[PDB]
């Protein structure tokens, strides 16, 4: 019988407490216990018991986490998105001034849903 495969240690043990976290979760991704260096627990505990640990925790997998949208990341993201924006006319200070120069208002709605269509 050949030796069975050993799982490596979680790479959270190699993470420094002063790292650039946005590089770990750059985009929306499911919760990964081996990559999130937090002793977070979730689950209604049993009597005289603790909430279940993160490893194999389906409740933490069910959450739409915001690990990819930390305040540090959002601020870095928007610094790169400033080059894409344009400046609102300063003359249009109030709604009454907009109505004077732009008397027509056009309303349209876009709908974002999840699915193939």
């Amino acid at each position: 019988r050949p030796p069975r495969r050993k799982a490596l240690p979680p790479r959270t043990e190699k993470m420094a407490v002063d790292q650039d976290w946005p590089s770990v979760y750059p985009v929306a991704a499911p919760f990964k216990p081996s990559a999130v260096p937090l002793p977070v627990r979730m689950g209604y505990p049993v009597k005289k018991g603790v909430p279940m640990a993160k490893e194999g925790n389906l409740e933490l997998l069910k959450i739409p986490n915001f690990l990819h949208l930390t305040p540090v990341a959002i601020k870095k993201h928007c610094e790169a998105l400033k080059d894409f924006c344009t400046e609102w006319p300063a003359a249009l200070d109030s709604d009454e001034k907009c109505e004077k120069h732009f008397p027509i208002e056009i309303d349209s709605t876009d709908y974002v849903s999840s699915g193939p269509s």
Partner: protein
């Protein structure tokens, strides 16, 4: 030798957390605390537990109604049930001289209280309550019977009746909780002034689905406007007008204030009730403190909690059942 089915699997047992385990759980929480602070771009040194709970709620948003089922990152002391560490050392000798009672913490407390009662002899209500049994079961970190709790309370009462000194008073207060004695005294709305300088107060009231907002003027002639209409034109039913009279009449102030109120929702009676409550609360700004307590005791400042009960499936109404078919 022979094989019999085994009693059980050792994993199928109550989990005991050795002191070494808690020691390493605290090292993980301190490292994770600095990671979480780095994630949010905050100073790791001044990162508090309130910031942790805020950061965990943002990063792991859970709408589960039971908060105990939501993501949590707390200090192990708070998380793990604080079952006392092994109550003996390596040599097997228990640390506490009352170990073999099985209730060393409870009986150590009874022993200390009984000893104080002895020393006093040799020498010789509304504000707070006694702690509940579940609060004693946490100070001691043991399970208690109901009669165990009573005996301890009977022993503390026996200690107050004595000429207890300062040392015997700090001890009893450890088991007296600060009862939530927020007074029943009604909160008085501030007195505002309009453009013309006329003093008035404003309050709100709810009855069933009706919601009212009333402005009671400090001085007036007894005029009441409901949605811009005279109260007797808005409320042609004599009972609805009596409800508007009730607050002012009870404090002897008919013909002394002007009221302009707005009410929406509900029926005619519910709207009269909502206006009654709104006017009474606003009127409390212009009466003496004793008069405000009399209005409270007359039922003029309490929101009526009686609302329609939902219909249940399988029965005709909220309480009425379908006819039990003839057998």
């Amino acid at each position: 030798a022979f094989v019999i089915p085994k009693k059980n699997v050792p994993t199928s047992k109550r989990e005991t957390y050795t002191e070494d385990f808690i020691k390493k759980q605290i090292e993980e929480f301190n490292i994770g605390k600095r990671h979480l602070a780095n994630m949010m771009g905050e100073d790791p040194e001044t990162f508090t537990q309130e910031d942790i709970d805020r950061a965990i709620a943002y990063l792991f948003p859970s709408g589960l109604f039971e908060k105990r089922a939501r993501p949590v990152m707390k200090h192990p002391e708070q998380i793990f049930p604080r079952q006392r560490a092994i109550q003996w050392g390596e040599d097997g000798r228990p640390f506490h001289y009352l170990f073999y009672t099985g209730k060393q913490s409870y009986y150590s407390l009874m022993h200390d209280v009984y000893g104080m009662l002895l020393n006093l002899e040799k020498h010789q209500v509304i504000g707070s309550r006694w702690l509940i049994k579940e609060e004693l079961e946490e100070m001691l970190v043991e399970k208690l019977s109901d009669l165990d709790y009573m005996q301890f309370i009977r022993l503390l009462e026996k200690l107050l009746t004595s000429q207890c000194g300062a040392a015997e008073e700090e001890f009893v207060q450890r088991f007296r909780r600060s009862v939530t004695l927020e007074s029943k005294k009604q909160l008085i709305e501030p007195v505002q002034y309009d453009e013309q300088g006329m003093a008035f107060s404003k309050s709100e009231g709810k009855r069933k689905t009706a919601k009212a907002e009333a402005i009671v003027y400090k001085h007036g002639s007894g005029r009441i406007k409901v949605n811009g209409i005279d109260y007797q034109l808005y409320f042609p039913i004599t009972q609805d007008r009596e409800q508007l009279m009730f607050p002012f009449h009870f404090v002897d102030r008919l013909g002394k204030h002007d009221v302009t109120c707005t009410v929406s929702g509900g029926g005619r009676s519910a709207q009269a009730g909502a206006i009654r409550l709104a006017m009474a609360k606003a009127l409390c700004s212009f009466v003496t403190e004793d008069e405000v307590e009399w209005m409270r005791q007359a039922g003029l400042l309490t929101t009526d909690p009686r609302v329609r009960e939902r219909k249940k499936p399988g029965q005709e109404g909220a309480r009425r059942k379908f006819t039990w078919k003839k057998r």
